[PDB]
Nucleic acid binder design. Structure first.
Ligand code: MG
Ligand code: ZN
Ligand code: ZN
Ligand code: ZN
Lengths: 171, 57, 607, 100, 192, 115, 46, 54, 105
DNA sequence: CAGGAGAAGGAGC
DNA sequence: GCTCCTTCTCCTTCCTCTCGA
RNA sequence: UCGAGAGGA
């Protein structure tokens, strides 16, 4: 249960090439390049956007007065408007047991792909005493093969690199 | 030291030589034409301190 | 300046806070205690002034941020002072609060009721309430009724300010204008004038001695009167350091949030920070980064010479007052104190005075008169050779041509005559869009020297591809892809900026120095006159500029954006400057030959 | 999210208390020279950056002349926000003004 | 930063108010050249008519509101004139002081209105028998001429007021035609 | 107009320091175009049209295998008037170290000349 | 004189709201008189 | 580094986030693929393996 | 276009949280990462962050010489003359902290 | 070589 | 408690070139 | 980088 919705108040710049369709202008200019990315102010991965309700700099205007006044910079021709929008954020915090995908079981690592989104790489010492690799598949403490899916915990969220690195131990 | 005095003009004294100014004694004899060069040998004036004073008598 | 990248944020207001050493030690990156700036090899020696953690260098890198010198803004260091030193800006205020303090009760010499009413008045002078700042003198009725007086004054001020904030008299963050500031400066001047007179204490009746300074740093403590020492023992000349003064004024300020939250803050103080004596005293000299102290390229920076003198005194005291304390307090007894502690009354002069010369270089120590004494940080700000009147107000700019001026009555009064020197050299950044593709394809094909042409092309990524070394077919190939944009996500909303030449469409500014009035600077449409070097005009302009033609020079400024060329053609063009606002009179008409032409032509004997 | 939404409503209330409706505006409907210059400049920058041109220009490369031609039928979608000294701002569209 | 605001008041940068109207009339010194040249503007009448275009200035301009007030101010003015200014108490406001001169056609300064009415007094023969030019049409033209020639909200008149005093001081030749006592003259006086 | 440029290579030596940089060329490869304005003893020939940046004197360094070259200073295309070669007032323990080139610049009457 | 007025400006903790032209040139935003006495905004369709 | 026209300048939060149910996922996040027929295409190409398993 | 946009137009960056132009350096990432801008006064030590509920690895960043820091994220780009930055570094030697209040908050 | 101006403290009032 | 006769303690057009440290 | 001198307006 990590498909959450959050309302945010961002502040976009609007291009003069879209002073006639600002809805699709901001949907192509700022919202589409935030799909499937970490963000430092929500801490999650965005999956869908809905509810682009651009505010107006006219305080006496309404929802049907669509003369949406957008403020012009003193030098550049770009606009800078406030917007409220709902996002479908996917984020774990500490240890969320969710199913997974595995392409190839390997020897010294395992290499889980988290529902074709990111990686769940497991280090050397995180491999327990009972689990040893055989020459690729695993024979664990059961001794019988399992389904291709796999549930796993969450250790820590590492966002320095190109993608988010999420670790998980299995005890 | 005398070549330094003629090369810069900054008078280095132990008694001031009973003058007022310190710098500006030697001017480069330019030769752009004969008039400018013959001018520098008859160019006398009061001083370089009076050029900053604003009372003009 | 750029147009493809808009400035996102916006600076609104500027506040004047104080760094203290608690902020600076968390702030800075490297302590600087070594005079070994460069070794005999010439390399930067760490711990010294040209350290590699204070920014990059020429062949080096930065140890703090790790980037090249093109991209390294530099980082600032901190010299840990041995002694809390006087900030030489704040000195007379410290002298006032020290000379008007009581050493015993650790409040002021003046009575507490007057201090409380000046606190209430200067609190009323933060919301602008001058309507109530003189009603407070009309509140006057021992030991305990004065407490009721102060409580009633306090709740009176409370109800007045709460009433003014209830309606729309004053907003949340006060109001501060010239009337408010005049009243406040007058009251604070009268307050600090009254504090310098009441020598006898109004809280205990004891006596604190008079101080008198010699120059800047020495504070002779004047000996007391006979009757004052007598009155001291009934109720029951000397140099003085800065740590004693720090302790005295800190003990004063810790008991005195009341009046000094109001003298030192002319606004409603939101965060309610405290008033320490650490604002007056210095503990770390913040050394500037590398790229603001580089040598001339060779003479090194004269700021480093004074920092090396400060660190020479700092290592002398790190020698002495660390290596004397490890010695015994019994063997260092009698004849080891008339010489060694005759040196700490001479090595504190040279840690204070060198920081003074580092900042306030007027207060210094004499010498046999030499060439030039070294300027400080105050000396690099104050005058026409300073910083405000030399690098913020009066700047040297790009895109500004200059030559001699010439007569030309075959071009109109709003027209400028441009020689092809400047028609080749100066450029203008037009974007590329299909209404302007023909002239820009022809301008890139013509190249850097066939006017109309173009010298540079700025990509959507911001790269300045120059056309100088490129051949004929290495310019004719570029105009076949200016039209097609890229598939880039970030720059599908931009276009390449062709830097074309100045041509007959543009408009320049013109400017003859000195400008005594505002008609000495106008805007002129462009004509390129072939095979010349001088700029040249009509004669209508040459009465406004006070321009004869015995060799005058003018600064053609060529503005680079569409905003200024849309303002140079309407608000400051020559056609809107006919009447000067001195008297509403014309200054622009024809001159010498045209007047005697018009006398002969309009005469009756011209058939 | 409580404090930011609170300060958001604070700032929008302090801005709406300054906003003056179209029943009250005590400013003249003459464009000054300054408003004409800035409207021509800003429309020049907008047309220079791929705006839909509302005129059918006949051989023009100067974008400032394109802006001066679009003003002839007042086809300039901009609005001047005139600032009284206390930030109490009025909105005048370009197509509600005496273009002088 | 001392400039002209939208309430037509000479107000500084933050809001400190220096004057209420620019000079007394909120006029521009450049564009006030031929306004008191009434004998000129009687002529070239159709030229100024096609210049000013009053018929496009009908709907966005409340006309007769200041016009009813101004005649009452002028009749109360001529009603009490011989008394000095301390005897001359104030009953109600002048014409510009109540009504906005750039929105109400007819909100006109007092001395210009007095010179207009005195010119239309002493030269009725030129109005009657030269081109049949009506006096009411000429007055309703000059009421528009006073309003088109008004100072703009936004003009830095502080810079201009500085430069129009600093620059003519450069024309002051330092010798002094003084003797006939004496008095300090020129830049030694203007700096003092 | 007659300019003069006194090029010397005695700016990096003191107290009998050996001659680091010699006038002339060396036995490496070098772009071969420099001969059009330079003699093969480093110095330029008399009377040569030199625009901006074209060479005025060439020296072979002994250290870095470099024939580092002197480029023309200003932008007025001048003509080489003289190449004077000054000896040393010591006992000529050093080689040639001082070359005082002159330059000639034409001044036609042009638009702006104050007669 | 700078450091006298700077001494006074620190000892008030003086907020400055960027009102005069000189402070708006030092900081470099826009100047208040003339063109910068107002703003421009853009009507859009929907 | 990125400029002021790719990712927005200032992002804050207005309200604390609230979960959605399983059947309320595909109220728009199914028609988002039914209406849009790497930053947009591989987005839904990886959303085919994320939101389907709920 | 004659005193800012020609001479020393410097599109600098200010910490929104403390308001100072001089401090906010570049971060030093690992290989296969990105280098953002992080503050210095508001960012605090990694050795002092474990004072206390568990801390996510978001505010953690690294400098050049390896001292890992925590925090100081809120920075944004303004456009100033470069002589403003020279003025701030000339005033910091006198002991003055200019604060630049910047909206959008 | 100016050119007076503002602020301050003790010697008389 | 109040005042005057000295101090401190202050501050100010654009451009080009060369010479020398 | 600072002082001295020359010169134009
Ligand atoms: Mg002249
Ligand atoms: Zn660095
Ligand atoms: Zn006491
Ligand atoms: Zn910070």
């Amino acid at each position: 249960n990590c498909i959450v919705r959050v309302p945010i108040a961002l502040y976009v710049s609007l291009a003069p090439m879209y002073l006639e369709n600002p809805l699709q202008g901001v949907m192509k200019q700022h919202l589409n390049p935030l799909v499937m990315k970490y963000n430092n102010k929500v801490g999650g991965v965005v999956l869908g956007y809905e509810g682009l309700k651009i505010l107006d700099a006219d305080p006496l205007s309404k929802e049907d007065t669509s003369e949406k006044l957008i403020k012009i910079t003193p030098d550049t021709p770009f606009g800078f408007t406030w917007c409220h929008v709902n996002l479908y954020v996917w984020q774990p915090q500490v240890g969320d047991v969710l199913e997974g995908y595995i392409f190839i079981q390997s020897a010294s690592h395992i290499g889980l792909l988290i529902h074709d989104a990111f990686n769940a790489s497991i280090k050397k010492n995180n491999i327990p005493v009972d689990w040893t690799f055989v020459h690729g598949h695993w024979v664990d403490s059961n001794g019988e093969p399992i389904d291709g899916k796999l549930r796993f915990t969450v250790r820590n969220v590492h966002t320095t690199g190109r993608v988010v690195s999420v670790d998980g131990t299995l005890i | 030291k005398m070549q330094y005095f003629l090369s810069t003009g900054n008078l280095v004294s132990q008694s001031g030589l009973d003058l007022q100014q310190v710098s500006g004694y030697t001017v480069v004899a330019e030769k752009i034409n004969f008039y400018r060069f013959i001018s520098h040998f008859r160019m006398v004036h009061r001083g370089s301190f009076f050029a900053q004073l604003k009372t003009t008598t | 300046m750029d147009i493809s990248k808009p400035v996102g944020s916006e600076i609104t207001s500027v506040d004047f806070g104080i760094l203290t050493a608690k902020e600076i030690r968390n702030l800075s990156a490297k302590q600087i205690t070594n005079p070994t700036v460069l070794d005999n090899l010439g390399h930067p020696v760490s711990g010294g002034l040209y350290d590699l953690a204070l920014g990059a260098f020429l062949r080096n890198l930065c140890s703090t941020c790790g980037l090249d010198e093109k991209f390294c803004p530099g980082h600032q260091g901190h010299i840990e002072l041995p002694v809390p030193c006087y900030n030489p800006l704040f000195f007379n205020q410290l002298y006032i609060y020290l000379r008007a303090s009581c050493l015993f009760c650790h409040h002021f010499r003046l009575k507490s009721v007057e201090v409380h009413r000046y606190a209430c008045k200067l609190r009323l002078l933060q919301y602008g309430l001058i309507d109530e700042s003189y009603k407070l003198d009309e509140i006057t009725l021992s030991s305990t009724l004065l407490n009721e007086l102060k409580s009633k004054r306090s709740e009176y001020v409370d109800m007045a300010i709460a009433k003014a904030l209830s309606d729309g008299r004053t907003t949340e963050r006060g109001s501060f204008t010239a009337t408010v500031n005049d009243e406040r400066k007058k009251l604070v001047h009268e307050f600090h004038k009254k504090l310098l007179s009441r020598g006898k204490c109004d809280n205990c009746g004891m006596f604190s001695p008079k101080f008198r300074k010699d120059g800047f740093t020495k504070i002779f403590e004047t000996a007391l009167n006979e009757k004052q020492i007598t009155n001291n023992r009934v109720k029951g000349s000397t140099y003085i350091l800065s740590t004693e003064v720090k302790n005295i004024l800190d003990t004063v300020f810790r008991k005195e949030q009341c009046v000094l939250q109001y003298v030192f803050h002319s606004r409603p103080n939101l965060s309610r920070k405290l008033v320490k004596a650490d604002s007056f005293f210095m503990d770390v000299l913040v050394v500037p980064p590398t790229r603001f102290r580089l040598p001339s390229k060779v003479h090194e920076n004269s700021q480093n010479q004074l920092l090396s003198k400060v660190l020479t005194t700092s290592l002398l005291i790190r020698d002495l007052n660390d290596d004397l304390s490890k010695l015994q307090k019994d063997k260092v007894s009698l004849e080891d104190r008339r010489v060694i502690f005759s040196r700490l009354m001479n090595a504190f002069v040279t840690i204070q005075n060198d920081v003074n010369a580092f900042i306030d270089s007027t207060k210094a120590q004499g010498r046999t008169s030499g060439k030039v004494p070294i300027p400080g940080v105050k000396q690099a700000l104050e005058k026409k050779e300073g910083l405000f009147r030399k690098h913020m107000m009066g700047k040297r700019v790009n895109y500004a041509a200059r030559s001699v001026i010439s007569p030309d009555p075959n071009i109109e009064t709003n027209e400028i005559g441009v020689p092809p020197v400047f028609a080749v050299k100066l450029t203008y950044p037009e974007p590329v869009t299909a209404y302007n593709i023909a002239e820009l394809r022809q301008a890139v094909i013509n190249g850097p020297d066939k006017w109309p042409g173009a010298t540079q092309i700025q990509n959507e990524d911001g790269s300045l591809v120059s056309l100088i070394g490129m051949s004929v077919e290495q310019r004719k190939a570029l105009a076949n892809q200016l039209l097609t944009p890229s598939s880039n996500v970030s720059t599908h909303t931009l276009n390449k900026k062709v830097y074309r030449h100045i041509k007959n469409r543009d408009v320049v500014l013109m400017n003859r120095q000195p400008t005594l009035h505002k008609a000495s600077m106008m805007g002129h449409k462009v004509r390129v006159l072939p095979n010349e070097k001088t700029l040249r005009l009509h004669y209508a302009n040459t009465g406004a500029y006070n321009a004869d033609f015995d060799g005058d020079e003018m600064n053609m400024h060529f503005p680079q954006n569409e905003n200024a060329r849309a303002e140079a053609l309407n608000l400051a063009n020559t056609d809107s400057q006919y009447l000067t606002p001195t008297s509403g009179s014309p200054v622009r008409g024809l001159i010498q030959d045209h007047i005697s032409a018009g006398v002969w032509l309009t005469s009756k004997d011209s058939f | 999210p409580e404090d930011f939404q609170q300060h958001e409503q604070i700032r929008r209330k302090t801005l709406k208390e300054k906003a003056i409706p179209k029943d009250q505006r005590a400013t003249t409907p003459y464009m000054t020279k300054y408003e004409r210059a800035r409207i021509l400049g800003t429309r020049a920058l907008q047309i220079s950056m791929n705006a839909p041109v509302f005129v059918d220009l006949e051989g023009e490369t100067d974008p400032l002349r394109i802006a001066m031609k679009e003003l002839a039928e007042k086809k300039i979608p901009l609005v001047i926000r005139r600032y009284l000294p206390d930030g109490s701002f009025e909105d005048w569209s370009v197509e509600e003004l005496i273009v002088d | 930063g001392v400039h002209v605001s939208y309430d037509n008041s000479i107000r500084d940068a933050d809001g400190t108010l220096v004057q209420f109207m620019y000079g007394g009339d909120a006029i521009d010194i450049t564009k006030e050249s031929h306004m008191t040249q009434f004998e000129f503007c009687l002529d070239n009448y159709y030229a100024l008519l096609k210049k000013y275009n009053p018929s496009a200035l009908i709907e966005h301009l409340d006309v007769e509101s200041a016009l009813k007030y101004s005649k009452k101010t002028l009749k109360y003015r001529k009603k009490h004139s011989k008394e000095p200014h301390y005897k001359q108490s104030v009953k109600y406001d002048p014409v510009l002081a109540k009504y906005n001169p750039a929105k109400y056609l007819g909100s006109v300064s007092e001395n210009f209105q007095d010179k207009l009415e005195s010119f239309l007094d002493k030269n009725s023969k030129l109005f009657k028998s030269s081109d049949g030019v009506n006096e009411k049409k000429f007055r309703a033209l000059m009421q528009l001429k006073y309003m088109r020639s008004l100072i703009n909200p936004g003009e830095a008149v502080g810079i201009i007021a500085s430069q129009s005093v600093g620059e003519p001081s450069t024309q002051m030749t330092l010798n002094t035609f003084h003797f006939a006592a004496n008095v300090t003259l020129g830049i030694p006086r203007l700096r003092e | 107009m007659y300019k003069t440029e006194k090029v010397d290579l005695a700016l990096n030596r003191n107290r009998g320091d050996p001659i680091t940089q010699h006038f002339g060329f060396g036995n490496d490869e070098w772009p071969k175009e420099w001969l059009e304005k330079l003699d093969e003893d480093g110095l330029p020939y008399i009377g040569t049209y030199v625009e901006e940046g074209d060479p005025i004197c060439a020296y072979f360094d002994d250290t870095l295998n470099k024939t580092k070259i002197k480029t023309y200073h200003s932008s007025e295309p001048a003509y080489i008037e003289e190449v004077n070669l000054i000896g040393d007032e010591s006992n000529k323990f050093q080689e040639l170290q001082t070359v005082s080139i002159k330059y000639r610049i034409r001044r036609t009457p042009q638009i702006g000349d104050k007669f | 004189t700078t450091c006298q007025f700077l001494t006074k400006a620190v000892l008030d903790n003086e907020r400055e709201q960027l009102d005069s032209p000189s402070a708006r040139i030092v900081v470099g935003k826009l100047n208040n008189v003339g063109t910068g006495s107002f703003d421009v905004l853009a009507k859009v369709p929907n | 580094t990125a400029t002021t026209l790719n990712t927005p300048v200032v992002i804050h939060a207005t309200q604390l986030p609230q979960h959605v149910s399983t059947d309320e996922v595909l109220q728009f996040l199914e028609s988002f693929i039914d209406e849009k027929e790497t930053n947009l295409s591989s987005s839904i190409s990886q959303l085919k393996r994320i939101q389907r398993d709920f | 276009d004659r005193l800012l946009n020609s001479s020393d137009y410097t599109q600098a960056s200010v910490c929104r949280e403390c308001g100072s132009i001089l401090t906010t350096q570049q971060s030093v990432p690992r290989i296969g990462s990105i280098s953002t801008v992080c503050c210095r006064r508001c960012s605090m030590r990694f050795e002092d962050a474990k004072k206390l509920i568990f801390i996510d690895d978001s505010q953690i960043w690294e400098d050049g010489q390896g001292n890992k820091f925590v925090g100081g994220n809120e920075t944004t780009t303004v456009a100033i003359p470069f002589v403003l930055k020279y003025l701030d570094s000339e005033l910091s030697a006198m002991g003055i902290r200019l604060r630049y209040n910047v909206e959008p908050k």
